[PDB]
Amino acid sequence: DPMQGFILHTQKVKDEDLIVYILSSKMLIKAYRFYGLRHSSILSGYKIDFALEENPSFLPRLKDVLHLGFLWIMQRDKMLIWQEFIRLLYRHLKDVEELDSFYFDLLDECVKRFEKQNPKRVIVDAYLKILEFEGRLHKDFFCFACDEKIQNSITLLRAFLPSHSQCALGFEFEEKKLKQFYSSKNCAIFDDEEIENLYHLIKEGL
Ligand SMILES: [Zn+2]
């Protein structure tokens, strides 16, 4: 039975084999690939079609691997950003087994949007969806530190946690624009430098 997934991480084992961590629509899989170091289809961030052979008391063996390429796979700039996000997502999901199809479907949509959109903008939009799906999005701007309302200029920290600029160091964004971003799920309201700063917050960890 074929399955599809995104490779989130690989680790060399034995001479040329790989342990391959794969996000599917049902599960984060930890699988064993014979001679995986030789296989140009097996790289973090790649999407694959594959099958699994179950093994008693051991990892499933990764078989029947077909690389599902991206239209933009040759653009090293975009692939760098993609692999940064994938590594952040691996660390976020590292201890998870079963999970919602949300995560696989989110990555599928990112890959599509990567064709024509700015990769950092796509990741910023995607992270907003992760926060909302996990119930971690603070749409009310109450300061994490002093518990008071924050108005007009909002400081954001890791995981878009809100603060007064006088209460914590982070990056500042206009309230009206953050509200538009959170409502529309579209970071188009922010200019390029604001996107860069949201992306720096994402790189603190999901
Ligand atoms: Zn405060």
Residue numbers in the entry: -1 to 204
What does the paper say about this structure?
The crystal structure of cjRecO was determined by single-wavelength anomalous diffraction (SAD) phasing and refined to an Rfree value of 20.8% at a 1.8 Å resolution. The cjRecO structure contains all the residues of the cjRecO polypeptide chain (residues 1–204) and takes the shape of a curved rod consisting of five α-helices and eight β-strands. The curved rod-like structure can be divided into three parts: an N-terminal domain (NTD; residues 1–69), a C-terminal domain (CTD; residues 70–134 and 173–204), and a Zn2+-binding domain (ZnD; residues 135–172). The NTD is composed of five β-strands (β1–β5), which fold into a closed barrel defined as an oligonucleotide/oligosaccharide-binding (OB) fold. The hydrophobic interdomain residues combined with the internal residues of each domain form a continuous hydrophobic core that penetrates through the three domains. Despite the extremely low sequence identity, the cjRecO structure folds into a curved rod-like three-domain structure as observed for ecRecO and drRecO but with relatively high root-mean-square deviation (RMSD) values (2.7–3.0 Å for 173–185 Cα atoms). The Zn2+ ion is located at one end of the rod-like cjRecO structure in the coil-rich ZnD and coordinated by two cysteine residues (C141 and C144) from the α3-β6 loop and by one histidine residue (H162) and one cysteine residue (C165) from the β7-β8 loop. Thus, cjRecO uses the CxxC…HxxC motif to coordinate a Zn2+ ion in a pattern similar to the Zn2+-binding CxxC…CxxC motif of drRecO. In the cjRecO structure, the Zn2+ ion tethers the two extended loops of the coil-rich ZnD and thus seems to stabilize the hydrophobic core of cjRecO at one end of the rod-like cjRecO structure. In particular, in the cjRecO structure, the positive patch is limited to NTD and CTD and does not extend to ZnD (left).
In bacteria, the recombination mediator proteins RecO and RecR are required to load the RecA recombinase on ssDNA for homologous recombination. RecO is a key recombination mediator protein that has DNA- and RecR-binding capacities. RecO alone promotes DNA annealing, and it stimulates RecA loading on ssDNA when complexed with RecR. To structurally and functionally characterize RecO, we determined the crystal structure of RecO from Campylobacter jejuni (cjRecO) at a 1.8 Å resolution and biochemically assessed its capacity to interact with DNA and a metal ion. cjRecO folds into a curved rod-like structure that consists of an N-terminal domain (NTD), C-terminal domain (CTD), and Zn2+-binding domain (ZnD).
